[PDB]
RNA sequence: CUUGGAUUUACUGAAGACUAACUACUGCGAAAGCAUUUACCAAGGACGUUUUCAUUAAUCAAGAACGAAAGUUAGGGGAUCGAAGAUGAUCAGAUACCGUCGUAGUCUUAACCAUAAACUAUGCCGACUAGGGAUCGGUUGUUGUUCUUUUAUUGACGCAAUCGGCACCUUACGAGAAAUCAAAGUCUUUGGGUUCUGGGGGGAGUAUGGUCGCAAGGCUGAAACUUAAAGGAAUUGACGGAAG
């Protein structure tokens, strides 16, 4: 039927990455960050800018062959914050939006079965 | 300057017949050259496909499948079975409070030789007509549900090959048979094998890959 | 309850309190003889036993253990004494 | 101030004094 | 004298003329005067024996080792230190190690060590206390103390 | 469990303590177990379970060394081996 | 009588060398003089000639031991995990 | 004077409790003094389940949740309005707001 | 930090830490504390008991054992965080809060230290005074329940009692200055046994002496002088870069 790549999307709090490899994850087809869409830094993650390094993906997606994506969303994980940014939902609506198939959706977040120590100290960030 | 896609060549993913949709899909790498085959760095690599996709049954939708390639013929690749997993939605919906998680892991080799570990988890039941909030078991039955857990992995896999398990896991063959024979130690719910692993594999025969295909 | 008989407490309500709590402790246990199936031989049995009990004449385990009241093995039947 | 400070301002005080104290031993 | 190990004398027989061969081994920890000493492919995993690398499981704590097959060993002689078997690879017939020194190496895995460690550790805790005590230690070993320094010549 | 039962045997039975008693005892046949420490050098030993076999002896190997067998018995020595010539009230001859 | 508080063995050492030092050779240097039980014959009869030997007088059986003890911790730990490699390797 | 009886965490019978880092300043807080919130959202926004069902390669394939439990310490908590600041007798009340 | 390919991606490997979710107004321990499995070692409370001994006991100056974290000594380890230190920002200034690095430390083995809001700011033993629903451990009688295996001698669940725990809810006979308290009640209607501590606020846990400690410091611990208040709980208001 279609041909599959995997879409590995990568969404922090400060920029929005849209990677879309082969099955094996071993090959990149395309990978456009919410950072190469702004100047502004504040904005790296954010929304817009998410659907629109979606649709750069979507794009370079057609013209290799790729028709559809399975969907694996993460966050920063490891000893940091485990949701999602806010980019990683604009990017999967634009990608969806864009004629581009969706397969499988899961979440892939690196979560620790413990934790080394997180930044910021005992007390915590004071602001 | 170049776009590097040019020189990409495609390959067709061929899973074992263990599965029913065994066309799983296509990858690329680089095309065969004087200096490097694009065959010798191809095999190795693994792919995760859900379970569900190999069986068309969505039932298998919490399992995903690592395939891995070991030979190539033309354009397509026979891949092996690599390993087992759940997915993370799947496990996070499970563990929930006011009752008792329950986990078990062993090392074990097959008939021919594949040394795995294999990942059990299982959770207590509420009794229909049981009025207390909680559901929790003493650490004395969890301690000889863990070892009932043991025990099994053990016996179901030390006497099969690698091929017959794969055929074994997929209808929860030894999860249902741990449900079976903890009943008289605690009521379970949700037993599952979450979890495999391929440590170390026995040397390569083509051969026997090859009765694996067809 | 302001006025209540203490020194005739119901015999229903006396047998619910703990066995220390009583007008005058008693023990709740008692003894047993009992049958094995195999022969017909009286032995005397506490009630909470904690020894493993064997009839003389087959070295047979007639009663296991445990936290409170001895179990009788299968077969076995007890008369109070 | 701080009572906790305060304890550390005498704690470093007391140190000058032995050390004063040490050069006629 | 000059060493910081003890030396093991050990008498094994000649397997082709009538006669007794002593060997000197550097003694490991817990090896005793008429222990049997086992040497060879298939000598088993106990405490002073001689074993190739390759036989010896990960983990394992050797003594003694051959730095090339057939040398009669050259790593981990000191007293207190050892050799820990990283991994092998069979396949290329060669096996990583760890040296007292921290260094990661690869020997074939047809050279020879001792199981153990060399006896002796822990002299380097005392203090030496006397000038004396330095002058009897070099007196067996060579002529390189006391040293003056450079600057004040 | 079994040095529960030893130390009765000591309290009423009889016994030779030692190495030039056991092996008498072994030659008339009045022994009726043979009792040897952990440590004790395994030529002894395996003339022990010779002088034993020709006896007709059973022969039980305790399973610490010849201070913790002295100890258990109840003395202040160390005793490297030791005969049963009358279990008493005991029945460590019924345990082997 | 109890002639030094704590310098014990180290008195012959005097006021010299610093305390420290002193005290750290008091600890290493009751250890090498002591005597230990002697695994063969259960005596506690093992004495240290050099570094590394320890004779039973007894037995008269010399072991390979530490610099200042009959076993280091090291080999302690070496001996149980050679038996445990020992039982796996031999089933 | 004393403000409220479980001193603001949940522990009694016991000695010492193991901290947590709170989710957004990553301050160490006890287990049992911290505001937990059990959270089961939806992975994608009520907007975009109809376009991603259409652009689905599945006929009926259900969406997976997204399972997170998120711990705040008492500043972090009180900021956010995970929690609110109560009247003197309302602060007692402990059953889950309906 | 990055066209010398960063970030990202798949596969593989090595290090140290740490045991997520299950995890609770639940459990255990004298306290500090304790959360992966299994094996080994020796402990422990409660319960059951028509077992045994018979006052062996309760609380305890002196004196012992243990005593978070940090810190000290010497090895080993040194992944992550991170005092000091360095740096980019902010600011009027910022040695800080925020950001990036980072040494001791954080881990472990032998020793030291002996302090924490080491808190329940609430000594221990014994007796009594009031109801209720939950819960953990044990024991004893009993089900329209599920299950071994088809059922029992399986296990789970359900209903009652009870002893012991961790707690909670209501009331106030009673206490309290109140906040509040099943003990902080049985205290002018004042006495069950017993250990420790305080006497207005500062000066001050300062000086000195002693003693313990490698040190940092610990334990013990004044006086001169100064002062009419300091302080507790609650009320009204005012204010708040708190919420509605
Ligand atoms: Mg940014
Ligand atoms: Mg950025
Ligand atoms: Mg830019
Ligand atoms: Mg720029
Ligand atoms: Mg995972
Ligand atoms: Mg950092
Ligand atoms: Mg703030
Ligand atoms: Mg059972
Ligand atoms: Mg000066
Ligand atoms: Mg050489
Ligand atoms: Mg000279
Ligand atoms: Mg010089
Ligand atoms: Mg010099
Ligand atoms: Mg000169
Ligand atoms: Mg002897
Ligand atoms: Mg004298
Ligand atoms: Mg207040
Ligand atoms: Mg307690
Ligand atoms: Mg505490
Ligand atoms: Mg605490
Ligand atoms: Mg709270
Ligand atoms: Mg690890
Ligand atoms: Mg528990
Ligand atoms: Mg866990
Ligand atoms: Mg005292
Ligand atoms: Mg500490
Ligand atoms: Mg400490
Ligand atoms: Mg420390
Ligand atoms: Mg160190
Ligand atoms: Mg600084
Ligand atoms: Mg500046
Ligand atoms: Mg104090
Ligand atoms: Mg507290
Ligand atoms: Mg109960
Ligand atoms: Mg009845
Ligand atoms: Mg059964
Ligand atoms: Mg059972
Ligand atoms: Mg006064
Ligand atoms: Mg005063
Ligand atoms: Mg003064
Ligand atoms: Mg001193
Ligand atoms: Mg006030
Ligand atoms: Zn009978
Ligand atoms: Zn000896
Ligand atoms: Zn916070």
Same mark, same amino acid.
């Given at each position: 039927?279609?041909?599959?790549?995997?879409?590995?999307?990568?969404?922090?709090?400060?920029?929005?990455?849209?990677?879309?490899?082969?099955?094996?994850?071993?090959?990149?087809?395309?990978?456009?960050?919410?950072?190469?869409?702004?100047?502004?830094?504040?904005?790296?993650?954010?929304?817009?800018?998410?659907?629109?390094?979606?649709?750069?993906?979507?794009?370079?997606?057609?013209?290799?062959?790729?028709?559809?994506?399975?969907?694996?969303?993460?966050?920063?994980?490891?000893?940091?914050?485990?949701?999602?940014?806010?980019?990683?939902?604009?990017?999967?609506?634009?990608?969806?939006?864009?004629?581009?198939?969706?397969?499988?959706?899961?979440?892939?977040?690196?979560?620790?079965?413990?934790?080394?120590?997180?930044?910021?100290?005992?007390?915590?960030?004071?602001? | 300057?170049?776009?590097?896609?040019?020189?990409?060549?495609?390959?067709?993913?061929?899973?074992?017949?263990?599965?029913?949709?065994?066309?799983?899909?296509?990858?690329?790498?680089?095309?065969?050259?004087?200096?490097?085959?694009?065959?010798?760095?191809?095999?190795? *690599?693994?792919?995760?496909?859900?379970?569900?996709?190999?069986?068309?049954?969505?039932?298998?939708?919490?399992?995903?499948?690592?395939? *891995?390639?070991?030979?190539?013929?033309?354009?397509?690749?026979?891949?092996?079975?690599?390993?087992?997993?759940?997915?993370?939605?799947?496990?996070?919906?499970?563990?929930?409070?006011?009752?008792?998680?329950?986990?078990?892991?062993?090392?074990?080799?097959?008939?021919?030789?594949?040394?795995?570990?294999?990942?059990?988890?299982?959770?207590?039941?509420?009794?229909?007509?049981?009025?207390?909030?909680?559901?929790?078991?003493?650490?004395?039955?969890?301690?000889?549900?863990?070892?009932?857990?043991?025990?099994?992995?053990?016996?179901?896999?030390?006497?099969?090959?690698?091929?017959?398990?794969?055929?074994?896991?997929?209808?929860?063959?030894?999860?249902?048979?741990?449900?079976?024979?903890?009943?008289?130690?605690?009521?379970?719910?949700?037993?599952?094998?979450?979890?495999?692993?391929?440590?170390?594999?026995?040397?390569?025969?083509?051969?026997?890959?090859?009765?694996?295909?067809? | 309850?302001?006025?209540?008989?203490?020194?005739?407490?119901?015999?229903?309500?006396?047998?619910?309190?703990?066995?220390?709590?009583?007008?005058?402790?008693?023990?709740?246990?008692?003894?047993?003889?009992?049958?094995?199936?195999?022969?017909?031989?009286?032995?005397?049995?506490?009630?909470?036993?904690?020894?493993?009990?064997?009839?003389?004449?087959?070295?047979?385990?007639?009663?296991?253990?445990?936290?409170?009241?001895?179990?009788?093995?299968?077969?076995?039947?007890?008369?109070?004494? | 101030?701080?009572?906790?400070?305060?304890?550390?301002?005498?704690?470093?005080?007391?140190?000058?004094?032995?050390?004063?104290?040490?050069?006629?031993? | 004298?000059?060493?910081?190990?003890?030396?093991?004398?050990?008498? /094994?027989?000649?397997?082709?003329?009538?006669?007794?061969?002593?060997?000197? /081994?550097?003694?490991?920890?817990?090896?005793?005067?008429?222990? /049997?000493?086992?040497?060879?492919?298939?000598?088993?995993?106990?405490?002073?024996?001689?074993?190739?690398?390759?036989?010896?499981?990960?983990?394992?704590?050797?003594?003694?080792?051959?730095?090339?097959?057939?040398?009669?060993?050259?790593?981990?002689?000191?007293?207190?230190?050892?050799?820990?078997?990283?991994?092998?690879?069979?396949?290329?017939?060669?096996?990583?190690?760890?040296?007292?020194?921290?260094?990661?190496?690869?020997?074939?895995?047809?050279?020879?060590?001792?199981?153990?460690?060399?006896?002796?550790?822990?002299?380097?805790?005392?203090?030496?206390?006397?000038?004396?005590?330095?002058?009897?230690?070099?007196?067996?070993?060579?002529?390189?103390?006391?040293?003056?320094?450079?600057?004040?010549? | 469990?079994?040095?529960?039962?030893?130390?009765?045997?000591?309290?009423?039975?009889?016994?030779?303590?030692?190495?030039?008693?056991?092996?008498?005892?072994?030659?008339?046949?009045?022994?009726?177990?043979?009792?040897?420490?952990?440590?004790?050098?395994?030529?002894?030993?395996?003339?022990?379970?010779?002088?034993?076999?020709?006896?007709?002896?059973?022969?039980?190997?305790?399973?610490?060394?010849?201070?913790?067998?002295?100890?258990?018995?109840?003395?202040?020595?160390?005793?490297?081996?030791?005969?049963?010539?009358?279990?008493?009230?005991?029945?460590?001859?019924?345990?082997? | 009588?109890?002639?030094?508080?704590?310098?014990?063995?180290?008195?012959?050492?005097?006021?010299?060398?610093?305390?420290?030092?002193?005290?750290?050779?008091?600890?290493?240097?009751?250890?090498?003089?002591?005597?230990?039980?002697?695994?063969?014959?259960?005596?506690? +009869?093992?004495?240290?000639?050099?570094?590394?030997?320890?004779?039973?007088?007894?037995?008269?059986? +010399?072991?390979?031991?530490?610099?200042?003890?009959?076993?280091?911790?090291?080999?302690? +730990?070496?001996?149980?995990?050679?038996?445990?490699?020992?039982?796996?390797?031999?089933? | 004077?004393?403000?409220?009886?479980?001193?603001?965490?949940?522990?009694?019978?016991?000695?010492?409790?193991?901290?947590?880092? !709170?989710?957004?300043?990553?301050? !160490?807080?006890?287990? #049992?003094?911290?505001?937990?919130?059990?959270?089961?959202?939806?992975?994608?926004?009520?907007?975009?389940?109809? #376009?991603? =069902?259409?652009?689905?390669?599945?006929?009926?394939?259900?969406?997976?949740?997204?399972?997170?439990?998120?711990?705040? !310490?008492? =500043?972090?908590?009180?900021?956010?309005?995970?929690?609110?600041?109560? =009247?003197?007798? #309302?602060?007692?009340?402990?059953?889950?707001?309906?």
């Amino acid at each position: 039927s279609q041909v599959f790549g995997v879409a590995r999307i990568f969404a922090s709090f400060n920029d929005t990455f849209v990677h879309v490899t082969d099955l094996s994850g071993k090959e990149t087809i395309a990978r456009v960050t919410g950072g190469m869409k702004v100047k502004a830094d504040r904005d790296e993650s954010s929304p817009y800018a998410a659907m629109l390094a979606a649709q750069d993906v979507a794009a370079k997606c057609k013209e290799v062959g790729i028709t559809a994506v399975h969907i694996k969303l993460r966050a920063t994980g490891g000893t940091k914050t485990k949701t999602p940014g806010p980019g990683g939902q604009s990017a999967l609506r634009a990608l969806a939006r864009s004629g581009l198939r969706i397969g499988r959706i899961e979440d892939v977040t690196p979560v620790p079965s413990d934790s080394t120590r997180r930044k910021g100290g005992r007390r915590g960030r004071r602001l | 300057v170049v776009d590097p896609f040019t020189r990409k060549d495609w390959f067709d993913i061929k899973a074992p017949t263990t599965f029913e949709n065994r066309n799983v899909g296509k990858t690329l790498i680089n095309r065969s050259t004087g200096l490097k085959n694009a065959a010798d760095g191809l095999k190795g *690599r693994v792919f995760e496909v859900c379970l569900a996709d190999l069986q068309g049954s969505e039932d298998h939708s919490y399992r995903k499948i690592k395939l *891995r390639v070991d030979e190539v013929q033309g354009k397509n690749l026979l891949t092996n079975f690599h390993g087992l997993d759940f997915t993370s939605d799947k496990l996070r919906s499970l563990v929930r409070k006011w009752q008792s998680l329950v986990e078990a892991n062993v090392t074990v080799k097959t008939s021919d030789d594949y040394v795995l570990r294999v990942f059990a988890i299982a959770f207590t039941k509420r009794q229909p007509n049981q009025i207390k909030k909680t559901t929790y078991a003493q650490s004395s039955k969890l301690r000889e549900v863990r070892k009932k857990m043991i025990e099994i992995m053990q016996r179901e896999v030390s006497n099969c090959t690698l091929a017959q398990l794969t055929s074994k896991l997929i209808p929860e063959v030894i999860g249902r048979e741990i449900e079976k024979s903890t009943q008289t130690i605690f009521p379970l719910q949700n037993v599952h094998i979450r979890k495999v692993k391929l440590l170390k594999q026995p040397k390569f025969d083509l051969g026997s890959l090859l009765a694996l295909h067809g | 309850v302001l006025v209540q008989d203490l020194l005739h407490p119901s015999p229903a309500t006396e047998a619910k309190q703990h066995k220390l709590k009583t007008l005058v402790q008693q023990p709740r246990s008692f003894f047993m003889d009992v049958k094995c199936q195999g022969c017909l031989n009286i032995t005397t049995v506490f009630s909470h036993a904690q020894t493993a009990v064997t009839c003389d004449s087959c070295s047979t385990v007639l009663c296991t253990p445990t936290g409170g009241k001895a179990k009788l093995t299968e077969g076995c039947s007890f008369r109070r004494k | 101030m701080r009572d906790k400070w305060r304890k550390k301002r005498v704690r470093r005080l007391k140190r000058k004094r032995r050390k004063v104290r040490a050069r006629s031993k | 004298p000059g060493r910081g190990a003890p030396l093991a004398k050990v008498a /094994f027989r000649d397997p082709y003329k009538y006669k007794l061969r002593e060997e000197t /081994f550097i003694a490991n920890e817990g090896v005793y005067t008429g222990q /049997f000493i086992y040497a060879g492919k298939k000598a088993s995993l106990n405490v002073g024996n001689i074993l190739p690398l390759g036989a010896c499981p990960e983990g394992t704590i050797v003594s003694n080792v051959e730095e090339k097959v057939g040398d009669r060993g050259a790593l981990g002689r000191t007293s207190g230190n050892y050799v820990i078997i990283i991994g092998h690879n069979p396949d290329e017939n060669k096996t990583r190690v760890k040296l007292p020194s921290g260094a990661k190496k690869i020997i074939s895995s047809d050279a020879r060590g001792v199981i153990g460690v060399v006896a002796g550790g822990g002299r380097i805790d005392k203090p030496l206390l006397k000038a004396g005590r330095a002058f009897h230690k070099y007196k067996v070993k060579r002529n390189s103390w006391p040293k003056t320094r450079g600057v004040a010549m | 469990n079994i040095n529960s039962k030893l130390a009765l045997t000591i309290k009423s039975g009889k016994y030779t303590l030692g190495y030039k008693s056991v092996v008498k005892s072994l030659r008339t046949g009045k022994a009726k177990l043979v009792i040897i420490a952990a440590n004790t050098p395994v030529l002894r030993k395996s003339e022990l379970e010779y002088y034993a076999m020709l006896s007709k002896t059973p022969v039980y190997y305790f399973q610490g060394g010849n201070n913790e067998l002295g100890t258990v018995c109840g003395k202040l020595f160390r005793v490297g081996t030791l005969s049963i010539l009358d279990a008493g009230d005991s029945d460590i001859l019924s345990s082997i | 009588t109890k002639r030094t508080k704590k310098v014990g063995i180290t008195g012959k050492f005097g006021v010299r060398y610093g305390s420290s030092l002193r005290r750290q050779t008091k600890k290493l240097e009751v250890q090498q003089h002591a005597k230990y039980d002697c695994s063969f014959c259960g005596k506690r +009869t093992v004495q240290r000639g050099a570094t590394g030997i320890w004779n039973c007088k007894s037995c008269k059986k +010399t072991v390979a031991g530490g610099a200042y003890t009959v076993s280091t911790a090291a080999a302690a +730990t070496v001996r149980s995990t050679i038996r445990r490699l020992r039982e796996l390797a031999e089933a | 004077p004393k403000k409220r009886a479980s001193n603001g965490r949940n522990k009694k019978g016991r000695g010492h409790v193991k901290p947590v880092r !709170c989710l957004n300043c990553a301050r !160490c807080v006890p287990k #049992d003094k911290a505001i937990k919130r059990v959270t089961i959202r939806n992975m994608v926004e009520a907007a975009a389940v109809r #376009d991603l =069902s259409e652009a689905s390669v599945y006929a009926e394939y259900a969406l997976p949740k997204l399972y997170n439990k998120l711990h705040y !310490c008492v =500043s972090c908590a009180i900021h956010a309005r995970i929690v609110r600041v109560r =009247s003197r007798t #309302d602060r007692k009340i402990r059953t889950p707001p309906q």
